[PDB]
Amino acid sequence: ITGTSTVGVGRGVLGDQKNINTTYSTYYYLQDNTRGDGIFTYDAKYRTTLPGSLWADADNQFFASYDAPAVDAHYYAGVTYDYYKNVHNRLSYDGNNAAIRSSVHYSQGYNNAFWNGSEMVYGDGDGQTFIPLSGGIDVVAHELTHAVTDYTAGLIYQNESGAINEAISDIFGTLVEFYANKNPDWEIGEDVYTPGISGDSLRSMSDPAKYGDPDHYSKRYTGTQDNGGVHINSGIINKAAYLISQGGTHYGVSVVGIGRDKLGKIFYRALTQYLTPTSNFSQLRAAAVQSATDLYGSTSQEVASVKQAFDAVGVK
């Protein structure tokens, strides 16, 4: 829409107040003209037709309960844009400031959120398993990182390459949550999963086995469910990434942690310069080792820690 850039106020899914970038033209729309070619948020009105209608509001105040998922989808897409621009010098998911579009209120009682290849889509949850999925900053950044992968390595969504694709989204989802410093941790989806149970989450990067996902290559799922285990076998790479950042001893192998910032630089370089669509876990190890070599030197502690971490999870 063509109009005047302004700032409105509202409340997200968890009840927190935040300011949001909007555009005025008769109505106030959820259109942020300050980031690249724009961030646009649409109402899918409980239907599955996409994208729906650009979100319009009469007074620039978004405190209705129906508004909450749109407030957080719009705001957290801006935070994710800021992380990639400020930390990695990348302008939007294509690297050319492509517009970011998201639709909320998709379907009825839909327990998921996803990047569909053109835009973000978020369900409201059934209220038991999930609350509106855009309330989780790690979920929003996990899904927008799929758009980055699509335009760079292009990892296919099955078998080991799909598991790498999922782990890259959990790694950067987590790094965005730390960047925003929104109560950060190494768990995924704990702000929106099971409102009635405290302390759990969908997945854990520090201890994948807590929820039954593999934390070693010898325990990898080999069947056909979940596209060859893309959400299950990502645990092996997620544990490696946690060890590289934080350190620890895992199955008797000790790793010295190098911190989150270097973890992010190593994996972003691996994703944008060395991974290909059909890379497997072994090729990811090679890409991460080469990336660390490029940035820190072949005889650095950083290269040593990457090698030890893949050794700890049995990936050679």
Binding site listing for Zn(2+): 142, 146, 166
What gap in Å lies between CA 226 and CA 208, rounded to an integer? Answer: 17
Catalytic, 143? Answer yes
CB of 39 to Ca ion, least distance (A): 19
Q: Which of residues 164-183 bind Zn ion (CB under 5 A)?
A: 166, 169
Residue 138 interacts with Ca ion (CB under 5 A): yes or no = yes
Residue 291 interacts with Zn ion (CB under 5 A): yes or no = no
Catalytic residue among 143, 160, 250, 302: 143
CA distances to 43, 130, 258 from 281, in Å:
39, 31, 21
**Residue 124 binds: one of Ca ion, Zn ion, none (C-beta under 5 to 8 A by kind):** none
Q: Give the residue among 304, 293, 149 at the shortest CA–CA distance from 234.
A: 149
Q: What mask, x for binding Ca ion by CB under 5 A, covers residues 44 to 83?
A: -------------x-x-x----------------------
Residue 223 interacts with Ca ion (CB under 5 A): yes or no = no
Catalytic, 231? Answer yes
Partners of 130 in the β-ladder: 193
Catalytic residue among 74, 88, 231, 250: 231
Closer to Ca ion at the Cβ: 183 or 299?
A: 183
- Name the binding residues: 57, 59, 61, 138, 142, 146, 166, 177, 183, 185, 187, 190, 193-194, 197, 200
State the residues that interact with Ca ion by CB under 5 A.
57, 59, 61, 138, 177, 183, 185, 187, 193-194, 197, 200
What amino acid positions are annotated as catalytic residues? 143, 231
